[PDB]
């Protein structure tokens, strides 16, 4: 079980077509501070769903 020919750039490029990614597009705006984040996640400064949290 070993290859007998060289795979080309077309086989490799058509093989790597399913390895791409996409944008997150989940940025929500916190109503308290006016900063963006992910949905169901927290901000950097310490705000979640408009409610202030620990923020150490």
């Amino acid at each position: 079980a070993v290859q007998q020919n060289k795979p080309t750039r077309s086989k490799r490029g058509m093989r790597r077509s399913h390895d791409a990614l996409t944008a997150v597009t989940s940025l929500s705006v916190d109503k308290t501070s006016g900063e963006k984040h992910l949905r169901h996640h927290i901000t950097a400064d310490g705000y979640y769903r408009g409610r202030k949290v620990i923020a150490k």
Partner: protein
């Protein structure tokens, strides 16, 4: 008057960077850090520093109007490979190849 920001000899492979660099092509600069900041790959950390370098050159070395810039030129090239050895079974001398990177991103307002 354009802005050139490039990185030589990154601690990464030549292939995995191009999975990240194809995402931010043609996007607005102000929303590009919003994508690359919360992107989960290691290569997004380097290109965030490259892009924030280009924004800083658009502030200090350019006149004004940072917001209306668009990401136009982006391409990732491979560099030299680092050659070392690695032990295996049956005592043969296996060579290994370490990839380096060259990320040349040119951004401008027009």
């Amino acid at each position: 008057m354009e802005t050139i920001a490039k990185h030589r000899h990154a601690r990464s492979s030549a292939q995995k960077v191009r999975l990240v660099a194809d995402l931010i092509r043609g996007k607005k600069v102000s929303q590009a850090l919003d994508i690359l900041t919360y992107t989960n790959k290691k290569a997004a950390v380097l290109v965030k520093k490259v892009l924030e370098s280009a924004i800083a050159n658009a502030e200090h070395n350019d006149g004004a109007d940072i917001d209306d810039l668009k990401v136009t030129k982006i391409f990732v090239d491979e560099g030299p490979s680092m050659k070392r050895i690695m032990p295996r079974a049956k005592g043969r001398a296996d060579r290994i190849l370490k990839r380096t990177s060259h990320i040349t991103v040119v951004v401008s307002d027009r």
